C-alpha cells in the first residue's frame, strides 16, 4: 500500500473507534500512590488506538469560567485537557465522573501512550495512541504536559 492508502485506512479505523466509544482491553485498578488508574487487559501494539480522552469539548471563555469555579471546591480534581486548534484554545473538560476511561489514566513523562489531535470534519478530538507495545497487566500512562513551577511544587509527581 502507498502512504496515502495506509493513512486513509488508519483514519477510518480511528473515526470508527471514536464513534462507538468502544473501550476494550482496559480495566480500572488502584495503583499505589496514584488513586485509580487504567491497566491493559490485553497486549496493545505500538501505534494502536487506545482510548479517546473523552469529556466536554469547550472553548476558552467557558474553560476559564469553569476553572474559577473548580478552584473553589478542592474535592474536584484536575481533568481539564487544553490544546490549540485553528488558532484557538480548546479544552476537553472531563471533570464530571463518567464511565469513560481516558480521564482515569495517570501521568508519566516516560509512559506508554501519546496524545494526538484527530480532526473529524472540523471537530477536534484528543486520542491516546500506544507509543510502544503495552503489556497485559501494565498501567497505561501519558505525559500530562504541565511542567509549570506552580504545578510541580504542588504535584511533584509531575516531575517524572
Amino acid at each position: 500500500k502507498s502512504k496515502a492508502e495506509l493513512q486513509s485506512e488508519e483514519r477510518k479505523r480511528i473515526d470508527e473507534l471514536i464513534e462507538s466509544g468502544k473501550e476494550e482491553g482496559m480495566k480500572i485498578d488502584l495503583i499505589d500512590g496514584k488513586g485509580r488508574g487504567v491497566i491493559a487487559t490485553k497486549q496493545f501494539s505500538r501505534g494502536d488506538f487506545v482510548v479517546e480522552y473523552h469529556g466536554d469539548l469547550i472553548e476558552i471563555t467557558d474553560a476559564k469560567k469553569r476553572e474559577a469555579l473548580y478552584a473553589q471546591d478542592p474535592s474536584t480534581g484536575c481533568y481539564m485537557y487544553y490544546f490549540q486548534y485553528l488558532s484557538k484554545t480548546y479544552c476537553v473538560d472531563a471533570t464530571r465522573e463518567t464511565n469513560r476511561l481516558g480521564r482515569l489514566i495517570n501521568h508519566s513523562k516516560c509512559g506508554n501512550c501519546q496524545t494526538k489531535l484527530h480532526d473529524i470534519d472540523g471537530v477536534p478530538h484528543l486520542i491516546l495512541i500506544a507509543s510502544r507495545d503495552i503489556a497485559a497487566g501494565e498501567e497505561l500512562l501519558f505525559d500530562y504536559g504541565d511542567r509549570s513551577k506552580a504545578s510541580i511544587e504542588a504535584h511533584p509527581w509531575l516531575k517524572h
Binding site: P74, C78, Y144, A154
Partner: peptide, 8 residues
C-alpha cells in the same frame, strides 16, 4: 493548587 493537562 491545581494542575492542567496540556497537549505537546
Amino acid at each position: 493548587k491545581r494542575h492542567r493537562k496540556v497537549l505537546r
